[PDB]
Amino acid sequence: EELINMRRYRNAARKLIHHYSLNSTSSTEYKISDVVMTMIFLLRSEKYHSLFKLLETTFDDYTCRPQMTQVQTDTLLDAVRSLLEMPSTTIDLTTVDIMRSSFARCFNSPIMRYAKIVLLQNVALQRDKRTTLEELLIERGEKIQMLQPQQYINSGTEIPFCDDAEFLNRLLKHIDPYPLSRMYYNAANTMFYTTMENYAVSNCKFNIEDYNNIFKVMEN
Amino acid sequence: INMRRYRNAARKLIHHYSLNSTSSTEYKISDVVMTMIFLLRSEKYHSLFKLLETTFDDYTCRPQMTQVQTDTLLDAVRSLLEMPSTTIDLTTVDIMRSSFARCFNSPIMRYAKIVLLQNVALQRDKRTTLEELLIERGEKIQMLQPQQYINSGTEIPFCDDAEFLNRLLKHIDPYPLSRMYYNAANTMFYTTMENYAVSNCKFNIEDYNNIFKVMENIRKHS
Amino acid sequence: KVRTVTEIVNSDEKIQKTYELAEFDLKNLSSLESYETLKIKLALSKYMAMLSTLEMTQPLLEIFRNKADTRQIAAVVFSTLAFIHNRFHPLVTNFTNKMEFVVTETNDTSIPGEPILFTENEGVLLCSVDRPSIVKMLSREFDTEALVDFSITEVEATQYLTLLLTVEHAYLHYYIFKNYGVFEYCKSLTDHSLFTNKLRSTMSTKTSNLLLSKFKFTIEDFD
Amino acid sequence: SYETLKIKLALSKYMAMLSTLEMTQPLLEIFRNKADTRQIAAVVFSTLAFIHNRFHPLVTNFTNKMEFVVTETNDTSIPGEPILFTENEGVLLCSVDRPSIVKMLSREFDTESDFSITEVEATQYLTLLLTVEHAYLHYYIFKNYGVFEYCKSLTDHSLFTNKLRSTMSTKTSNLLLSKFKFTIE
């Protein structure tokens, strides 16, 4: 193209194309327009238009690619050599497949995407008012594996049988005679209310009788 | 050669860049390439293609074009977009061109380096902020009387039959309303602020974020 | 209604106490999504209800895009303001005689930022709005939904919704001004941060509408 | 009674775990914090060890091994026991609902050299130990009975309290839990 000053543009194109052999890299730098310019150069000439039209499959995997005559194939390596400088090295379908893999290492969709918002769903529970924890266990327990465990305080083996009666003495002389009953009452109240609030959150219902039996301790 | 498919793909790119489509994951390089190929093989669009080619800073030389040409080009653009229903400033398109120049000069690799920046392109601005803005505003506002008002049974219209409303309720029922907010509103608001790039007001997210700490307060007060 | 008793083995002495179901069903109701969906659905329904008395002129976007008249535009604005006010409080109104208002035509006349602008002098309360910017805002959607007897279009219902959030945002500044005069108002609208940092007094039985509690972005560039 | 004397004495000796050695005590409710798990994990672990060497007289050389996690959120909610424990191929694992512990301590309480004491403190310590007992029971049953029946007991804690008590009330006796009874109606 008049505007496209093709000589320099082809030169750059080859300067890239070489890197589709690991023998070369684009000075560790590349521009999209470089690729575009290469494709343009391919589409300016029939010998290279053939290869260009082959390479669409390299992202559209399922594209048809048929067989070719021995000469029809060697034509492509002839065009490759004509592009290339010092083509006296190995020229082969091995290099061609290296090129295909190099396109699959060039087109990896390095995203651009500009900018977008991000939203959240804070909470959710389902309408089945008497759903049960049991199935909910199935989801919950996955977090054992999903989430990182946290290391114990490796203080070394011990148990605190190390509590001789000095502070004890004045503690047991404060020993305030509080009405232990009502503290027990408050404790039980808070403890049950815990689970009541848990169920009222989770939208689940439970056997009060079974909770009673669960609590029960005294026998004989 | 499936020119048709090529176009079908290509469109979305410019569609997004021009106007902030609430679609996503538009990016791919192959799509860009096919876009360029289509433009090359579209004689009528070769003017646009050769303009968009101009992507190099030391040589930034977008040619003069007669208003005639520019209008013809915008017609072409709109038609191909199948959206004559509005027209957008050529300046927006040139800003997107500068964005594409960014992309070109950026050898972004496997890492999804989303640019995320709002477009910085613009020419001959002065740096400005709310100070300059306020100072400007007063005269430009006070120089004009408000147009008009008249009463039209103004006072406190009120609700009507709940079942009448339940009709519309049921109509509304199925839709992804929980998502609708992102699906237009928020994206459009946030993208609207290119007005700051207009006359180079340095937009800062650093207060736009305020929404976030704002929203806590309802949960604080249960 | 549920009685309970607690006892200690050493004594017959026992504590008796009762508790009431109601709060618990209340809580689960409030934790159930559909119940929550009722709120916003009712909001939109009631708003459209009020509009039903209006000379609605359903093609809302093009009505706003007309430019040939401003009476309808002004009336829509005002009515929306009243709607928000009566939302926030059950029993409110504004003096109705006249509030002659403005149309904003170009960026040079427009604030980049809050498109709805408020000013007052000599008792002349006045407001202004950039139709151009509002139109451009309305003009663009691309809901693919690929995310995870009145013929009211689902799509246009989007625009029907979207304005409300902006208008509410304005309402905030209006309230702040009306309670604290020019200086505090302008200082606050220098940087929206201050709003809630001041006005905990907003506390009320009904809430703002932005319940989907994230609106965030990549933290890169947060330099 | 002499029984109440013994009970309060037991609590008092647990007040050795209270103000335990090396333990920084910025609060008795440091669940208020979120930055450092270590202290909460430490108190939990130490309580387990104390209870274990109460319930048996001899294994002072308690194991030094554990992993822990802090449950914080409804989607991680575990209604029932706020704290959870397993052993996993010789690996002790545990999990804690800090929010639930916080709310439990939070709930207001009825009423009807120098030093001082306050009943609310004992209230907290009591509630702690009581809640720990339930987990200790499920731990104990699992510790010899297989996963199958263990999870059965998790689905219904009543079962084990109904059946496999062959360690009779004689063994139970140091479990001051039995001193308390309740009914809901």
Swiss-Prot record, chain A:
GO CC terms: host cell nucleus; virion component
Keywords for the protein's UniProt record, in alphabetical order: Host nucleus, Late protein, Virion
Chain segments annotated as transmembrane: none
Compartmental location: Host nucleus; Virion
Function: Plays a role in host nuclear actin polymerization by recruiting p78/73 protein that is capable of activating an actin-related protein 2/3 complex to initiate nuclear actin polymerization.
Quaternary structure (record): Forms a complex with proteins E27 and p78/83. The interaction with p78/83 mediates nuclear translocation of P78/83. Interacts with protein Ac102. Interacts with IE0.
Family affiliation: Belongs to the baculoviridae C42 protein family.
Record-given protein name: Protein C42
Originating species: Autographa californica nuclear polyhedrosis virus
Included stretch of the parent chain: 111 to 330 of 361
From Swiss-Prot, chain C:
Keyword terms, alphabetized: Host-virus interaction, Membrane, Modulation of host cell cycle by viral cyclin-like protein, Modulation of host cell cycle by virus, Viral envelope protein, Virion
UniProt keyword Membrane, yes or no: yes
A Pfam family reported for this protein in Swiss-Prot or TrEMBL: Baculo_ODV-E27
One cellular component (GO) term of this entry: virion membrane
Signal peptide stretch: none
Principal location listed in the UniProt entry: virion
Compartments reported by the entry: Virion membrane
Stored InterPro entries: Baculo_ODV-E27
Example of a GO biological process term: symbiont-mediated perturbation of host cell cycle progression
Domain of life per record: Viruses
Function, as annotated: Acts as a cyclin-like protein and plays a role in the modulation of host cell cycle. May promote G2/S arrest by interacting with host mus209/PCNA, cdc2 and cdk6. The cell cycle arrest is characterized by an intact nuclear envelope, concomitant with sustained activity of host cdc2. However, viral DNA replication still occurs in the arrested cells.
Subunit structure: Interacts with host mus209/PCNA, cdc2 and cdk6. Forms a complex with proteins C42 and p78/83.
Family named by the database record: Belongs to the baculoviridae E27 family.
Protein name: Occlusion-derived virus envelope protein E27
UniProtKB/Swiss-Prot annotation, chain D:
Subcellular location: Virion membrane
Primary site of residence: virion
Ranges that cross the membrane: none
Keyword Aminoacyl-tRNA synthetase: no
Key words of the record: Host-virus interaction, Membrane, Modulation of host cell cycle by viral cyclin-like protein, Modulation of host cell cycle by virus, Viral envelope protein, Virion
GO biological process: symbiont-mediated perturbation of host cell cycle progression
CC per GO annotation: membrane; viral envelope; virion membrane
Highest taxon, organism lineage: Viruses
Assembly description: Interacts with host mus209/PCNA, cdc2 and cdk6. Forms a complex with proteins C42 and p78/83.
Known function: Acts as a cyclin-like protein and plays a role in the modulation of host cell cycle. May promote G2/S arrest by interacting with host mus209/PCNA, cdc2 and cdk6. The cell cycle arrest is characterized by an intact nuclear envelope, concomitant with sustained activity of host cdc2. However, viral DNA replication still occurs in the arrested cells.
Recorded family membership: Belongs to the baculoviridae E27 family.
Protein name: Occlusion-derived virus envelope protein E27
Gene designation: E27
Residues of the full protein shown: 41 to 269 of 290
